[PDB]
Design a protein around this ligand. Structure first.
Ligand code: B12
Ligand SMILES: CCCCCCCCCO[C@@H]1O[C@H](CO)[C@@H](O)[C@H](O)[C@H]1O
Ligand SMILES: CCCCCCCCCO[C@@H]1O[C@H](CO)[C@@H](O)[C@H](O)[C@H]1O
Ligand SMILES: CCCCCCCCCO[C@@H]1O[C@H](CO)[C@@H](O)[C@H](O)[C@H]1O
Ligand SMILES: CCCCCCCCCO[C@@H]1O[C@H](CO)[C@@H](O)[C@H](O)[C@H]1O
Ligand SMILES: CCCCCCCCCO[C@@H]1O[C@H](CO)[C@@H](O)[C@H](O)[C@H]1O
Length: 175
């Protein structure tokens, strides 16, 4: 890939974040947050390590703007916010791990996705419940009710985007 193709890819990833990080799952009007799939897909495909911290930086300034200027609720922003970072890293590591084996991969992909997203969900949903300070008496039961509610739609968002990456790749492979 030329420098130009790299810049193009870079901008399309930042733009995707820009356009989707205000929706955790799909609505009639809007695309859901591509962020979790992106970090996973960076794990799968992109060797350069520096891209991950760069794309984290982008996510953070995007959230700040969305809320400061874009009129988006700041409900979700709290001391627990930084727990996004280990979730992003877990997803990236997930994609690295999936690429290591099977260097056919599909039923293996599903199992890897479910596990790696579950780690991200614990860190984020669990981080928020336990450390946002918006919950006076957080319990294990309470944690699990919330994982049960949020995991399916956020997993579906992830599978939407990773699904498409897969079908793009298999296509391009033929081509
Ligand atoms: C709603 C929401 C939003 C809304 C804004 C808030 C709002 N509109 O109230 C939107 C979509 C705008 C939003 C945006 C963001 N969000 Co938000 N958001 C959520 C969500 C889905 C719920 C908030 C919540 O927990 N409220 C607290 C109460 C109301 O809900 P609860 O604790 O679960 O309890 C109630 C429900 O379970 C309800 N209930 C029980 N059963 C049932 C059944 C039904 C049918 C219903 C409807 C309700 C219901 O009753 C309970 C009352 O005790 C959570 C999901 C999650 N927790 O994983 C993320 C979450 C809080 N958001 C998060 C983040 C980070 C963001 C962003 C800052 C960036 C991002 N995309 O990651 C952006 C904003 C910046 C930007 N735009 O660029 C993270 C926080 C991560 C962390 N702290 O480490 C979370 C935890 C998502 C995640 N798993 O990553 N978000
Ligand atoms: C939003 C704008 C996007 C900017 C993208 C252009 C810069 C690309 C840098 O190249 C990357 O540098 C790695 C460093 O380790 C190398 O391994 C490898 O050459 C490549 O992956
Ligand atoms: C959302 C992240 C998107 C990044 C896509 C650009 C990186 C290009 C990937 O190059 C190589 O391509 C082969 C087939 O495409 C892969 O098998 C290989 O593992 C990968 O390293
Ligand atoms: C701010 C985020 C920037 C993200 C931009 C990612 C650019 C893609 C990385 O470069 C390319 O990666 C392929 C797989 O590693 C290599 O096949 C190719 O030779 C290399 O040039
Ligand atoms: C059930 C999921 C558990 C997640 C593991 C908790 C990590 C350590 C707890 O410290 C947390 O560290 C974050 C950054 O270091 C801060 O954002 C947060 O305020 C702080 O309390
Ligand atoms: C039966 C398997 C063992 C469950 C693990 C023990 C922790 C407490 C369980 O939390 C509860 O789990 C229910 C399903 O088990 C959910 O429907 C409910 O919303 C949730 O709050």
């Amino acid at each position: 890939l030329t420098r130009r193709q790299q810049i193009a890819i870079g901008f399309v990833l930042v733009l995707m974040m820009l356009l989707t990080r205000s929706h955790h799952w799909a609505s009639i009007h809007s695309l859901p947050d591509a962020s979790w799939a992106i970090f996973f897909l960076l794990g799968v495909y992109v060797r350069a390590l520096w891209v991950v911290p760069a794309l984290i930086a982008a996510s953070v300034v995007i959230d700040y703007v969305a809320i400061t200027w874009g009129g988006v609720s700041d409900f979700c922003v709290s001391p627990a916010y930084w727990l996004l970072i280990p979730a992003y890293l877990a997803l990236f590591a997930g994609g690295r791990f999936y690429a290591r084996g099977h260097s056919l991969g599909l039923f293996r992909l599903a199992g890897v996705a479910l596990a790696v997203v579950a780690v991200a969900q614990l860190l984020t949903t669990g981080g928020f419940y336990f450390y946002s300070g918006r919950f006076a008496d957080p319990t294990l039961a309470g944690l699990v009710l919330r994982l049960e509610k949020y995991f399916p739609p956020m997993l579906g968002t992830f599978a939407l985007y990773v699904g498409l990456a897969a079908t793009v790749h298999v296509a391009l492979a033929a081509v």
